Structure 1
């Protein structure tokens, strides 16, 4: 769960979504999963 302040879609498939203010990005490739903060 790579945690950091700069979050960006890695491949053309990641998705960036919001949840209780903590913007996180999700993808089928599990490695991509990263939140902001």
Structure 2
């Protein structure tokens, strides 16, 4: 998990969603998983 103020879809299979007030990027590649903070 990467915690940065800016989250972006690194690859073509990343999706941006919104859980519990955060903005999150979820991918099948565990490296690309990241959240905003």
TM-score by length of 2: 0.92
CA RMSD of aligned residues (A): 0.5
Which structure shows the bigger proportion of residues in strand conformation? 2
Ranges of 4+ aligned residues in structure 1 off by more than 2 Å: none
1:12 aligned onto 2:21: no
CA distance in 1 between counterparts of 2:12 and 2:19 reads 21
Gaps of 5+ in 2: none
Structure 1: gaps (5+ residues):
none
CA distance in 2, matches of 1:36, 1:24: 6
TM-score scaled to structure 1, two decimals? 0.92
Matched residues, number: 37
